[PDB]
Amino acid sequence: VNSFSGYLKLTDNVYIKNADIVEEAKKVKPTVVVNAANVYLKHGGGVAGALNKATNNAMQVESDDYIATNGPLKVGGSCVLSGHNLAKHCLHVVGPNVNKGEDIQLLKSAYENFNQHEVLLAPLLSAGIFGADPIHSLRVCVDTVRTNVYLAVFDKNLYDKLVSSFL
Ligand SMILES: OC[C@H](Nc1ncnc2[nH]ccc12)[C@@H]1CCc2ccccc21
């Protein structure tokens, strides 16, 4: 039993809600919140900008030190950093940005990172300003993640579309 509230069960291990991941994190303080990151951990907009702003830019400061030491992530890759005031940990996961010309097959690789964590609060990877088909992202999530994932989808209209079209 966990403290996630009001989620619609989709499969054995995947749950979904129409919510801002930042607000879900502020309320639940999960062990792991997933950021929809880019390879440079430059948290400008979307999920990343919203999470970072909620940390008063501490996420960005920590991320800049990470990159200075380790260099960029891979598309499809991840790193674990602090969750600051939002969660114990933040799993920064890089889904392909098809507006940047990146390979959609890497979306499965991106979701595989979730399997290293028993429970996660996560956004829909590669959706939104990352440009991919959100129905596709949800399908890849369900078919790839085996651990318990609570998906927060900000946009009400797309949430309604995601639920109504889910197979
Ligand atoms: O609603 C669309 C959804 N954005 C969010 N989902 C949940 N909490 C959120 N809080 C702020 C935004 C946001 C998709 C998922 C990945 C991504 C990256 C950039 C923009 C949009 C998106």
Domain boundaries, the chain: 8-163
Out of 17, 20, 26, 47, mutate this one to test ligand 1's pocket (max ligand atoms within 8 Å of CB): namely 47
Residue 104: other Cβ atoms inside 10 A: 16
73 DSSP 8-state letter: P
Type and span of the H or E element at 16:
strand 14-18
Q: Can you tell me which atom of ligand 1 is nearest the CA of 124?
A: 15
CA atoms within 13 A on the CB side of 15: 17
By what technique were these coordinates determined? X-ray
**Cα–Cα distance measured from residue 88 to residue 81, given in angstroms and rounded to the nearest whole number:** 9
The verdict on domain 8-163 having CATH code 3.40.50.300 is no
Residues 6+ apart with CB under 8 A from 91: 32, 33, 34, 35, 78, 79, 80, 113, 114, 117, 120
Resolution of the structure in the document, Å? 1.0
Whether 123 contacts 47, CB under 8 Å: yes
**In b/e form, how buried is each residue of 117-137, taking b as 16+ CB within 10 angstroms?**
beebbbbbbbbbebebebbeb
